[PDB]
Amino acid sequence: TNEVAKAVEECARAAKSAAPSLSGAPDTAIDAALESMADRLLAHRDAVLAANAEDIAKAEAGGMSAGLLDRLTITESRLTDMADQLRLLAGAPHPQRTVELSTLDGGLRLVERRRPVGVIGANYEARPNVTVDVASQLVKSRNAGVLRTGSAALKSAQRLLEVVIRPALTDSGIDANVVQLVPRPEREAAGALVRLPDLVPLVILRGSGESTRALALEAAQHGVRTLAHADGGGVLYVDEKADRDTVRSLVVNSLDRLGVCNRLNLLLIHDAVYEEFWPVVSEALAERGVSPSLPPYDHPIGYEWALDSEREATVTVARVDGVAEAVRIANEETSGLAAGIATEDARAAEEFFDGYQGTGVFWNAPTRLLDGFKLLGVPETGINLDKVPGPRGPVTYPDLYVRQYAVLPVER
Amino acid sequence: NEVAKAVEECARAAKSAAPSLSGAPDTAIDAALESMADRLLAHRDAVLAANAEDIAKAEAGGMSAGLLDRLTITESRLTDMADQLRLLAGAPHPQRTVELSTLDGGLRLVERRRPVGVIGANYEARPNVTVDVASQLVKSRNAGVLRTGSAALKSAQRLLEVVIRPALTDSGIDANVVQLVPRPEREAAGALVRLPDLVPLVILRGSGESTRALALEAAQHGVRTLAHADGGGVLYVDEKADRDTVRSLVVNSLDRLGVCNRLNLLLIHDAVYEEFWPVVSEALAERGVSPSLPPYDHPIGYEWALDSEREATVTVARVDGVAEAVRIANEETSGLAAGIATEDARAAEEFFDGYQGTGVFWNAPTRLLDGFKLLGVPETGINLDKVPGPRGPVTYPDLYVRQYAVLPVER
Ligand SMILES: [Ca+2]
Ligand SMILES: [Ca+2]
Ligand SMILES: [Ca+2]
Ligand SMILES: [Ca+2]
Ligand SMILES: [Ca+2]
Ligand SMILES: [Ca+2]
Ligand SMILES: [Ca+2]
Ligand SMILES: [Ca+2]
Ligand SMILES: [Ca+2]
Ligand SMILES: [Ca+2]
Ligand SMILES: [Cl-]
Ligand SMILES: [Cl-]
Ligand SMILES: [Cl-]
Ligand SMILES: [Cl-]
Ligand SMILES: [Cl-]
Ligand SMILES: [Cl-]
Ligand SMILES: [Cl-]
Ligand SMILES: [Cl-]
Ligand SMILES: [Cl-]
Ligand SMILES: [Cl-]
Ligand SMILES: [Cl-]
Ligand SMILES: [Cl-]
C-alpha cells in the first residue's frame, strides 16, 4: 500500500479546502491568532513539555546523538523565544492587498491585488519550535500549510498543533485545518511532499546538503517550486587595501557557528598583502579553533566545511591576484549565497559589488548577517538561491503571495 | 551537435557582454531605445528589402496567407514599432538601490535590483517581435538570446544588424548583449531551454502543444520560463446581470478569435439562461461565432483559439450559481482570466474572492489582460503560473533578481 504518499495527499487536500477561510480573514484576526498562540504556548507549558519529554525519552532509547537530542529538546529559553517571536510576527505590518492603479478607458478602473499562494509545503528537521515558526509565518501570509517534521519530533509537533496552533486559529474565526502536519514517521514523506504540483506548488526546504539537494531537484523535475539553500558557505575576500582590525573582527565574527550556511567558508587573500595579513588571520582563526586548508586541497575549492561534521572547524584559504579573480572564484566556484570584501578602497568595493552575482554582498561586514531577522526585523522563512525573478536570498512573509490584476467599473 | 553548439555560443557571447549593459546609466539605455526608433525609420529601405526576400521565399515554398501575414512588415507595422520604442524609452527606471535601514556595528542595508543576466526568448516568424523583445531586455538591462521562426531569420538578422546593434554601440553598450540564434532548425528552441547556468529564464511566446513541450523540457533541465501555453477567457453571466452590459462583453471579447484572452467559455446562471439565450445568440452571430452547447464533444474548457478549423466558436454552459461558476473556472480552465457580469456587488465580491486566475474582471472584457492595455508599457509575455514571481502580464520592471548589500554606514 501507498500509506505514506496517501497521508501527504490527504493533508494537502484538507489544507486546500480550508484555505479560503484564511484568505478572507481580516488583519486583526490573523494578528489575534498569533498573539493567542503565544499566550497558549506559555499557558500550556506543562502539556507541551510533557509531549517533548516522551520524544526525548524515545530518541535516547534509539541511540540518538547528544547534538540531535539538543535540537529535539525544548528548554525554557526556547519556549520563551518561541512566544517572543510569535508576538513580534503578530505586530509586523500587513502590506495592502489591493492597490488602485488607475482608471482605464470605458468607465473602468484597475487594481493590483496580492493573493495567497494557497497551500505551501515545508520540510524541516526534528526541532519542535520549527513547527510553530513555519505555521505562524504561513498564517501571517494567509497561506495554508502541509508541514513535515523529522519523525523524532512528531509527538512534540502534534501537541503544539493541537494545544497551541489550532485553538488560536479557531478562536480567531479561522478554520484550524489550514495547518496540517504529516502524521508519518517515514522519511519517504519528504519526497512525496515535492511531487504534488496541483496541490502544493511551493515547498520550503529547511535542510542543508545532499538530502535537501535531492529534494530540490526532484521538485523542479515535477514542476514544484522550492525555497531552498541546499548549498551555502560564505566567501570573504581580503583586498590589498584591507584594515587589519576589520579583518580580525570579520574572521572571528564569521565563525561563531560552524554548522550554518552563512559562515565564512572560503577566505581569498590578495597576493600583495598575504604575508602581512596572515599573522592576523592566523590569530583570528585560532581564536575560533579553526584550521586553515591550504593547497594542495583534498576537495574542490568551494567545498563547504559546514556539511562535513568531522571537519567543520576548517576554512579554505587561497591567494588571489586581485578583485577580478576574487569575483570569478566567488561566482564560479561557490553556490552564490553570500560574499564579502574587506577593504578601505571604495573603488575595489564597488567593483566587487558590481561583479558578484550572489544573494547578499558585504563590505567590511560578516556574511553571518544574511538572515531575515538580522536584516529586516521579521522572521526568516528560509533562504532561497534561485537565479530568476521571485523570492531570493532571505525570504520573509511578504514574499509569499502571487499577483492578480482586477478590473471593475470606475464608480464601483 | 551543431545546433546546440550555436545556441551555447550565443549564450556565452551574451553573458560575456552583459556587464556593459548592467553598468550602463538610464540615459544611455533610453538613448539607445530612441536611436533604434530613429534607425528603423531611417533604414526603412534595407529592413523592408530583407523582409521582401523572406516573403518571396515563403510564397515560393507554399506558406499560408495567415502565416505570410505574420511575416510581413507593413508600413504601419514599422511606424508602430518605432512608436513603441519611443514609449519604452520614456518609461521610468525603478530605483536600483534602495536604502532600507541602518544596522548594528555601524552598518547599513541596501536592497538592490540586479539583472537576471541572460534571458532567452522563443517566438514565431514575426519580424517585429525581435525588436519588441530585444528592446524590453535592453530596458531591463538583461542580455538576450533570441530564437525566431526560420521564415523570418533574414528579416530578423537585418533588424539586429541595422537597427538594434548600432543603437547599442552608439550609446556605449556592447552590441553582443543581443544575440539571435543563426540556425534554421526548430531544435534550437529546445536547445535554448537546456542551459540553466547561462540562460536561467526563457520567455516562450507561443501557444498550445509546442509551448507546453518547451515549458516541460525547461523544467526537466532546471530552467525557468515565462509562458502561457493555455488561454481562453471565461465569462460568468450572473442572475443580476444587465442586458446591454452582457451584450457588449460578448461582442467586445470576440474582436480577435486567435488570441489567448478572448471569450472562450460562457457560463450562465440557471435562473436567467432562457432569458439571456437570445442576447448571447445575437451577440455571437454578430461576430460570426457559433455556440457549442451540450452534449459537448470536447472538454468544457477546450480552447477554441488553438483549433484553427473551429476557432469561431464559444462554449456555453448553464451553471447553478456563483460557487459553481468559480469551481469550473478554477478547476477546468487555464487560470488565465475570468470575468463576471452582474449588478450585484456581493456576487462580484464573491467571484473576486474565489477565482484564482491571473486576472479577474467585473463588467469588463478579459481582452484587457495585457501589459500595454493595463499599464501603458509593452507586454513581455504573460506568465500563467501560480507561485511567487512574475504573473499575469509581464513588463520590464519584473525582469530582475533581488540582492541585499551591507556596507559601512558612512560609505
Ligand atoms: Ca460604464
Ligand atoms: Ca585599523
Ligand atoms: Ca607583501
Ligand atoms: Ca587569540
Ligand atoms: Ca556604470
Ligand atoms: Ca540553477
Ligand atoms: Ca504552437
Ligand atoms: Ca528531453
Ligand atoms: Ca428564467
Ligand atoms: Ca448541472
Ligand atoms: Cl483587513
Ligand atoms: Cl478590489
Ligand atoms: Cl529539507
Ligand atoms: Cl543566521
Ligand atoms: Cl543611471
Ligand atoms: Cl549600493
Ligand atoms: Cl522554425
Ligand atoms: Cl548551462
Ligand atoms: Cl514558444
Ligand atoms: Cl492581444
Ligand atoms: Cl453549487
Ligand atoms: Cl491583447
mmCIF file of N, CA and C in Angstrom, chain B residues 74-125:
data_model
loop_
_atom_site.group_PDB
_atom_site.id
_atom_site.type_symbol
_atom_site.label_atom_id
_atom_site.label_comp_id
_atom_site.label_asym_id
_atom_site.label_seq_id
_atom_site.Cartn_x
_atom_site.Cartn_y
_atom_site.Cartn_z
ATOM 1 N N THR B 74 4.619 45.653 -42.725
ATOM 2 C CA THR B 74 3.906 46.672 -43.463
ATOM 3 C C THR B 74 4.392 48.028 -42.987
ATOM 4 N N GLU B 75 4.068 49.070 -43.747
ATOM 5 C CA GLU B 75 4.466 50.423 -43.375
ATOM 6 C C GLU B 75 3.947 50.751 -41.981
ATOM 7 N N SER B 76 2.694 50.383 -41.734
ATOM 8 C CA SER B 76 2.044 50.642 -40.452
ATOM 9 C C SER B 76 2.739 49.913 -39.296
ATOM 10 N N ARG B 77 3.095 48.656 -39.524
ATOM 11 C CA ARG B 77 3.786 47.890 -38.521
ATOM 12 C C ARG B 77 5.142 48.504 -38.174
ATOM 13 N N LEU B 78 5.805 49.089 -39.172
ATOM 14 C CA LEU B 78 7.119 49.691 -38.979
ATOM 15 C C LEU B 78 6.976 50.950 -38.125
ATOM 16 N N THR B 79 5.981 51.780 -38.419
ATOM 17 C CA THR B 79 5.789 53.012 -37.630
ATOM 18 C C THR B 79 5.298 52.665 -36.211
ATOM 19 N N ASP B 80 4.456 51.640 -36.089
ATOM 20 C CA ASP B 80 4.033 51.143 -34.769
ATOM 21 C C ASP B 80 5.237 50.695 -33.922
ATOM 22 N N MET B 81 6.167 49.960 -34.542
ATOM 23 C CA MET B 81 7.392 49.502 -33.878
ATOM 24 C C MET B 81 8.218 50.696 -33.354
ATOM 25 N N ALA B 82 8.340 51.738 -34.175
ATOM 26 C CA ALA B 82 9.096 52.952 -33.815
ATOM 27 C C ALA B 82 8.387 53.675 -32.669
ATOM 28 N N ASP B 83 7.066 53.822 -32.779
ATOM 29 C CA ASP B 83 6.271 54.457 -31.722
ATOM 30 C C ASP B 83 6.460 53.732 -30.366
ATOM 31 N N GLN B 84 6.366 52.403 -30.372
ATOM 32 C CA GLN B 84 6.555 51.599 -29.155
ATOM 33 C C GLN B 84 7.961 51.755 -28.555
ATOM 34 N N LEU B 85 8.980 51.810 -29.404
ATOM 35 C CA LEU B 85 10.348 52.046 -28.926
ATOM 36 C C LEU B 85 10.482 53.402 -28.203
ATOM 37 N N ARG B 86 9.843 54.451 -28.733
ATOM 38 C CA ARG B 86 9.891 55.771 -28.085
ATOM 39 C C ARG B 86 9.108 55.794 -26.757
ATOM 40 N N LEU B 87 7.980 55.089 -26.708
ATOM 41 C CA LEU B 87 7.202 54.935 -25.477
ATOM 42 C C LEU B 87 8.065 54.261 -24.404
ATOM 43 N N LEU B 88 8.703 53.154 -24.782
ATOM 44 C CA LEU B 88 9.577 52.396 -23.882
ATOM 45 C C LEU B 88 10.779 53.238 -23.420
ATOM 46 N N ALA B 89 11.407 53.950 -24.348
ATOM 47 C CA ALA B 89 12.499 54.849 -23.996
ATOM 48 C C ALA B 89 12.065 55.863 -22.915
ATOM 49 N N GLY B 90 10.831 56.344 -22.975
ATOM 50 C CA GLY B 90 10.346 57.340 -21.997
ATOM 51 C C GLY B 90 9.847 56.754 -20.677
ATOM 52 N N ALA B 91 9.643 55.437 -20.659
ATOM 53 C CA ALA B 91 9.129 54.740 -19.484
ATOM 54 C C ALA B 91 10.123 54.854 -18.334
ATOM 55 N N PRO B 92 9.636 54.799 -17.087
ATOM 56 C CA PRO B 92 10.557 55.015 -15.970
ATOM 57 C C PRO B 92 11.491 53.845 -15.625
ATOM 58 N N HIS B 93 12.603 54.196 -14.980
ATOM 59 C CA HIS B 93 13.568 53.244 -14.447
ATOM 60 C C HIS B 93 13.404 53.149 -12.910
ATOM 61 N N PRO B 94 13.039 51.972 -12.398
ATOM 62 C CA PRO B 94 12.913 51.905 -10.934
ATOM 63 C C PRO B 94 14.270 52.089 -10.242
ATOM 64 N N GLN B 95 14.258 52.600 -9.005
ATOM 65 C CA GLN B 95 15.496 52.821 -8.240
ATOM 66 C C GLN B 95 16.180 51.481 -8.025
ATOM 67 N N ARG B 96 17.387 51.325 -8.560
ATOM 68 C CA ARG B 96 18.115 50.048 -8.443
ATOM 69 C C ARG B 96 18.780 49.809 -7.100
ATOM 70 N N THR B 97 18.863 50.850 -6.274
ATOM 71 C CA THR B 97 19.407 50.731 -4.922
ATOM 72 C C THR B 97 18.476 51.503 -3.991
ATOM 73 N N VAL B 98 17.928 50.811 -3.005
ATOM 74 C CA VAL B 98 17.014 51.406 -2.048
ATOM 75 C C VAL B 98 17.610 51.263 -0.651
ATOM 76 N N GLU B 99 17.794 52.389 0.030
ATOM 77 C CA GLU B 99 18.333 52.377 1.386
ATOM 78 C C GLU B 99 17.216 51.900 2.321
ATOM 79 N N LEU B 100 17.427 50.759 2.973
ATOM 80 C CA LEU B 100 16.404 50.199 3.854
ATOM 81 C C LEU B 100 16.503 50.672 5.289
ATOM 82 N N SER B 101 17.698 50.611 5.866
ATOM 83 C CA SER B 101 17.896 50.990 7.256
ATOM 84 C C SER B 101 19.350 50.853 7.675
ATOM 85 N N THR B 102 19.638 51.342 8.879
ATOM 86 C CA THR B 102 20.944 51.196 9.482
ATOM 87 C C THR B 102 20.900 49.888 10.250
ATOM 88 N N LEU B 103 22.063 49.370 10.609
ATOM 89 C CA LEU B 103 22.173 48.122 11.360
ATOM 90 C C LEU B 103 23.230 48.293 12.450
ATOM 91 N N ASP B 104 23.256 47.360 13.396
ATOM 92 C CA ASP B 104 24.235 47.400 14.485
ATOM 93 C C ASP B 104 25.655 47.273 13.932
ATOM 94 N N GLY B 105 26.624 47.777 14.685
ATOM 95 C CA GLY B 105 28.026 47.721 14.285
ATOM 96 C C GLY B 105 28.432 48.765 13.257
ATOM 97 N N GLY B 106 27.651 49.839 13.152
ATOM 98 C CA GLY B 106 27.943 50.920 12.213
ATOM 99 C C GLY B 106 27.759 50.533 10.760
ATOM 100 N N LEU B 107 26.720 49.751 10.479
ATOM 101 C CA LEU B 107 26.447 49.283 9.112
ATOM 102 C C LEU B 107 25.101 49.774 8.619
ATOM 103 N N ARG B 108 24.876 49.661 7.309
ATOM 104 C CA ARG B 108 23.580 49.996 6.704
ATOM 105 C C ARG B 108 23.218 48.935 5.652
ATOM 106 N N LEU B 109 21.920 48.795 5.398
ATOM 107 C CA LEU B 109 21.398 47.792 4.484
ATOM 108 C C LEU B 109 20.764 48.409 3.254
ATOM 109 N N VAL B 110 21.108 47.864 2.092
ATOM 110 C CA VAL B 110 20.543 48.310 0.833
ATOM 111 C C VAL B 110 19.879 47.125 0.106
ATOM 112 N N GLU B 111 18.717 47.349 -0.510
ATOM 113 C CA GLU B 111 18.109 46.309 -1.336
ATOM 114 C C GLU B 111 18.416 46.695 -2.780
ATOM 115 N N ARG B 112 19.106 45.814 -3.497
ATOM 116 C CA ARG B 112 19.468 46.077 -4.873
ATOM 117 C C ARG B 112 18.665 45.242 -5.873
ATOM 118 N N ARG B 113 18.437 45.848 -7.031
ATOM 119 C CA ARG B 113 17.801 45.193 -8.150
ATOM 120 C C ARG B 113 18.943 44.890 -9.112
ATOM 121 N N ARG B 114 19.126 43.612 -9.435
ATOM 122 C CA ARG B 114 20.151 43.176 -10.375
ATOM 123 C C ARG B 114 19.452 42.567 -11.602
ATOM 124 N N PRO B 115 20.111 42.597 -12.772
ATOM 125 C CA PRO B 115 19.507 41.966 -13.934
ATOM 126 C C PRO B 115 19.498 40.444 -13.743
ATOM 127 N N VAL B 116 18.623 39.745 -14.462
ATOM 128 C CA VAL B 116 18.631 38.291 -14.454
ATOM 129 C C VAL B 116 19.991 37.813 -15.060
ATOM 130 N N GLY B 117 20.485 38.550 -16.056
ATOM 131 C CA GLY B 117 21.750 38.230 -16.732
ATOM 132 C C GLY B 117 21.459 38.061 -18.212
ATOM 133 N N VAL B 118 21.281 36.807 -18.618
ATOM 134 C CA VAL B 118 20.916 36.465 -19.982
ATOM 135 C C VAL B 118 19.533 35.808 -19.912
ATOM 136 N N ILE B 119 18.608 36.315 -20.705
ATOM 137 C CA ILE B 119 17.246 35.774 -20.784
ATOM 138 C C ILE B 119 17.016 35.314 -22.194
ATOM 139 N N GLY B 120 16.491 34.097 -22.350
ATOM 140 C CA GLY B 120 16.183 33.595 -23.695
ATOM 141 C C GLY B 120 14.788 33.996 -24.135
ATOM 142 N N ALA B 121 14.540 33.927 -25.438
ATOM 143 C CA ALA B 121 13.212 34.191 -25.959
ATOM 144 C C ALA B 121 12.947 33.342 -27.201
ATOM 145 N N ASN B 122 11.847 32.591 -27.188
ATOM 146 C CA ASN B 122 11.453 31.786 -28.334
ATOM 147 C C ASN B 122 10.143 32.344 -28.860
ATOM 148 N N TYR B 123 10.080 32.614 -30.156
ATOM 149 C CA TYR B 123 8.884 33.212 -30.743
ATOM 150 C C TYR B 123 8.727 32.911 -32.230
ATOM 151 N N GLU B 124 7.550 33.218 -32.751
ATOM 152 C CA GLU B 124 7.208 32.870 -34.123
ATOM 153 C C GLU B 124 7.897 33.745 -35.154
ATOM 154 N N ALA B 125 7.709 33.414 -36.429
ATOM 155 C CA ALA B 125 8.371 34.116 -37.509
ATOM 156 C C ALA B 125 7.632 35.424 -37.797
#
